[PDB]
């Protein structure tokens, strides 16, 4: 179990490093892609509105 | 044919261009001399 | 005391021996994959904001389709996309799960791990590689026919190097299998080897090697998928 | 071309001397 | 003369050769691929991301070679074929 | 103790992998392909709408 | 007086060790060189990676062919040593 | 003859092979990566920050193999498989 | 006493190990270098590949030859060992 | 045959091999780094002062492998394990 | 112990080294010359006529040595000096 | 064991080793020189005539080493030093 | 058998390896450093002077390693530890 | 076994290694320096005179170690230290 204790300590250190450094940027990319697709959807909606407007003026 | 040969001297070194030479842009040396039988070479012609 | 091999759980059926531990790891990975698949299906936000599962899956799909298209027409090889994404997720989860701290003392003065990466067994990589081999050779048969395909592969690029071409074919599957094995097998050895050190000194190198193992498993899964897609594309041309 | 293939802080074409070199 | 000793020493020498070859190949291939990566980065900073995907492919090859040989050493040293 | 010889496991593991492919070929990959295709179509149609609005107001 | 077959097996093991040592060196170096070319080309022509991949992998397969031929012969040497009494 | 003599001599020679290969590979690969870095710096004085990240990416790979070899020699040297 | 034939078999096996080590190193390196050149050349001009294959498939064939023939010789070390009684 | 004589012979051969590999690595790496340095200084002489920063790392990160390797050779020759 | 036994074993090892070194040299030389030929042909297609001839020199200067080694390896495997 | 047999076997192994080393050196050198010559000719077709001059100056310096070994190789196998 | 003979043979093989590695390293490093210096001089005629100083830095390093190996092989051949 | 046979075999193999490594290093270094030189004349013919001075400086040094190695090799075969 002494090897078990050492292994658990190593895994805890690995999780520490992950959550500390790698998690923030990956979540940042997650949020960036989510917001990019949401912005694309909003742009589609407003372009549809603008098409309706242009048809009305035309 | 691009002439069958164009000799010259560049900053990199002496360059002898043949008709199907790969495109190549280079500068001529201060005392550059060019013989025919800066420098820009295109796929079809110098 | 390393004890390389020696599958922890083994059973017998149909007059043949089977490795219980590798089947357990493979089943666990398959269950994780199925859980993610069902989560995606239930939470497909086509119009809504994509969730973690949705964005992860679509990122995998888009990357894989990009390599496929760069290799061969997507319509020419539609099944290649699902097959390759399947291989990628399967291998990635298999290798990643080894990061979990499932290593203990076996009461024999050595280190034994409850979870052993399924790729650490030659059977797993053999199955994956042979399946991929049959798959892309069948695709080649469909594209060129049963008779044209062997002649095409034998001819290859230059006739007078025919032997190498055959070797290349035989090099395709084996090359795919062995590397994966190694890429994971070393890990299985290394952790066990790392266990020889005292725990209060063993912890640190274990962590360093485990993060390196995460990176190695990721890159190996990526290259395995890319090699699969490439071999599919090469088998279907002219 | 060359500027597009160089740092701007003063059928590809082979720039025998280094692209930055030619600018000077 | 305990043929066991002779076969064990032969297996150890074989595994040492396995390691020598694998380490040499991996080190040199990694160095060369990294040289290419760094040169591409310096010449074209914009391609920083793009060059990563080919580079990791190349590594996956070269390292694989070394690692493949590693397994074989593990086969020789631990479960040596033809033992007495 | 070769641990390099194929075992019965070879067959068994294969089976599991197969089913996973089957799951991914029907309930994951096709829906994701549809989602990506419709997102791209939305982008293209939105660009077309913006343009047509431009030469409508011009028109 | 020791068994001749033990000596033969030790010789076969050392031979196969050399087999795979040379194979590993060759494969690693050749693949690294090809990868360097691929990296340089992709850096030069940005989007040409898709087309460059196939010539790349022609050489990759060619290089790996020798490695795996040496694999086959290493297995021949070790699994069934030629002329093992 | 004592089996330990042959087994230990074989282990020593195998570990020596391991370190020879590891040193060769690490030195040459690291030198090549450094050559790339130096070329970048000379051609681009202000790129030192951008080029460092790829550099360590290469080194981490190269050195890793070497250290792997290092570790293995311990197993060969200190706890020789099949020692008897 | 030791059987001399066992010593001969072991020596021949080690010799063949060296044979294939050198052959694998040479073939891998030559293939990788010729590749690197081919990849770079095609990267410079895509269509150019149509012709660059010709010299490449020579050098490949010319280096693989130096392996294949070499291979035959190590077979002579094992299949029919010279000077074996 | 005394076991210790054989062990010492094997250890000496192993240390010789270790140091040969280390010398190969150190020499080739230093030569490559110096090649890069020479090219750089030829390109821009003023750069020389800064070029020593990365350069010393290379050799520093290369010679270490040699130096570390050297240390390991000692463990083979002066303290023959399992003699 | 049969003297011819050791003679032929050492001769086999020596011929192995002979052919290994020859194959390494020939392979590397052919690869380097082929890289040069590839680059030249890509650079100047019409130069092929004047490029194959110089190429056929170095390979001849390379293969020679390799083939020279063959001419000696046969010796060690068909007439080993000092056989007795 | 015949002392002459062991000495001659060691001599044969050493000669094979030395010839292999010379083979590697000559092959690498000749390939490199040929590559440089081919690149020069591709750059300057007209130059071929002058280019052969430095090339041979290199070739000797390479080739010579190879042939130098021959001498000592013979001394190892034919006139074995210290032969008993 | 005489232990001194075996230990002396081992030490001689060790020194052989020492100097093989040292010679390879010195030759390769010196050749590449040369190539760099000659290329630079070709590019820059007057620069030969200012180029010599860095060049001597390079060869000074590699040669030191080579010279170090000399000492060690001497230490092995002339003063063999544990000769007994 | 008489000691002299063992020490002689060890010395022969050791010297073979010495001068084989020397030959490999010398050949490859000569190839590299010759590549630099021949390319230089391929680029700047008039520079030949100023190229030879550094060229001979490097190649000579490349030879130096190799030639030095030969002496050590000659010491082993003929002046085997510790010969009984």
Residue numbers in the entry:
A (entry chain d): 1 to 58
B (entry chain H): 3 to 4, 20 to 54, 69 to 77
C (entry chain a): 10 to 247
D (entry chain G): 56 to 65, 220 to 233
E (entry chain Q), H (entry chain P), K (entry chain T), L (entry chain L), M (entry chain N), N (entry chain M): 3 to 86
F (entry chain b): 22 to 80
G (entry chain R), I (entry chain S): 2 to 86
J (entry chain O): 3 to 85
What do the study's own words say?
The membrane domain of the mycobacterial ATP synthase is embedded in the IPM, with the catalytic F1-domain of the enzyme extending into the bacterial cytoplasm and attached to the membrane domain by a central stalk and a peripheral stalk (PS). As do other ATP synthases in eubacteria, chloroplasts, and mitochondria, the enzyme couples a proton-motive force (pmf) across the IPM generated by respiration to the synthesis in the F1-domain of the enzyme of ATP from adenosine diphosphate (ADP) and phosphate by a mechanical rotary mechanism. The mycobacterial rotor consists of a membrane-bound ring of nine c-subunits, attached to an elongated central stalk, made of single copies of the γ- and ε-subunits. The mycobacterial PS is made of two proteins, bδ and b′.
In the mycobacterial enzyme, this inverted L-shaped half-channel is clearly present, but the water molecules that form the Grotthuss chain were not resolved. The mycobacterial inlet channel in the a-subunit contains the polar residues aHis12, aHis15, aHis16, aAsp30, aAsn104, aGln112, aAsp117, aGlu122, aLys125, aGln192, aLys219, aAsp222, and aGln229, which are probably involved in the coordination of the water molecules that form the Grotthuss chain. The proton inlet pathway then passes through a small aperture between α-helices aH5 and aH6 formed by residues aGly196 and aAsp222 into the interface between the a-subunit and the c-ring. As in the bovine and other ATP synthases, the outlet channel is more open and funnel-shaped. Polar residues aHis146, aArg153, aLys161, aHis166, aAsn174, aGlu177, aGlu178, aLys181, aSer184, aTyr240, aGln243, and aGlu246 are found in this region. In S2 (where there are no resolved substates) the c-ring has traveled two c-monomers further round (ca.120°), and in state 3 substates S3a to S3c have all traveled on to approximately the same position, four c-monomers (or ca. 280°) further on.
